[PDB]
């Protein structure tokens, strides 16, 4: 079990937790703000998944300061995790190419 694979896996579990915590924290942060739409868990969760992936649909977003703070944590966690996987694939590709040359 290599480091890059363990990291990829740890990042996945971690991202899943961030999404969940984020879903809960967003509702708690947004309810109480007139016009807020990130006020129920089911869509908050869909919102966090679309924030971590940055898919950008524009159908849901935070309007309060803490929601936005929560939003940054999810964004960064998402961008970082998917980037870590990229790095884990590079380590894989570099290692087997080295083999295909002997070393």
């Amino acid at each position: 079990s290599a480091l890059h694979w363990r990291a990829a896996g740890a990042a996945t579990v971690l991202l899943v937790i961030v999404l969940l915590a984020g879903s809960y924290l967003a509702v708690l942060a947004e309810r109480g703000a007139p016009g807020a739409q990130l006020i129920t868990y089911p869509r908050a969760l869909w919102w966090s998944v679309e924030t971590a992936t940055t898919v950008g649909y524009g159908d849901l977003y935070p309007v309060t300061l803490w929601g936005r703070c929560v939003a940054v944590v999810v964004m960064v966690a998402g961008i970082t995790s998917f980037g870590l996987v990229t790095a884990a694939l590079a380590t894989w590709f570099v290692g087997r190419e080295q083999e295909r040359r002997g070393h």
Partner: antibody
Amino acid sequence: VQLQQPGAELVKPGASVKLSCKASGYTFTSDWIHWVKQRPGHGLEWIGEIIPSYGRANYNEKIQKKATLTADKSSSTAFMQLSSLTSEDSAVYYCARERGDGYFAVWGAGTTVTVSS
Amino acid sequence: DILLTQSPAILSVSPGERVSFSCRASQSIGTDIHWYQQRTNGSPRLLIKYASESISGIPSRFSGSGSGTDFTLSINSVESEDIANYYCQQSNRWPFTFGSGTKLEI
């Protein structure tokens, strides 16, 4: 019986009463308890909400703030503090449970609050 | 906040007919509308959630439709027990808000 609310409360003008709502059954951390005001013959007016497993409360800002929400995690009871009441504050006050999904699946029988000397 | 207008305040119909209640929202809210039934001296009772999802324990006689800013609660074959006040409720934007209510009359 989801929400248990006392049948009534008599209150003198200027005085203040504290209503209770004892819940039971499936309880989650994502649960919100709501309070709704119904003046005889009229419709339903949303007062405020509380998230028990955190104690955060939100109030309807379009009306005069006469309430104060609180919760006691151990006895699974939600409380509403109505202060300095007048004839306008006389009505039935319901409490309801919301699973963070936006609709009130269950209500309390309601507590009739009367304000007179 | 979101204003929910309930068209005719009173609805008079004959036994057995199909009847429809209207709920107009001041802005687009998807399908985040819910209907409640309240009888004389009773408390509100959730009938339909998210505009059309039936609730367990509710007569199949009840159904809902719409999305955006126009919603309808329908009862196929009205009857005595259905005499009550009906209210819509939105969960799209925070303050939640309720409709003014519609009384069914046979």
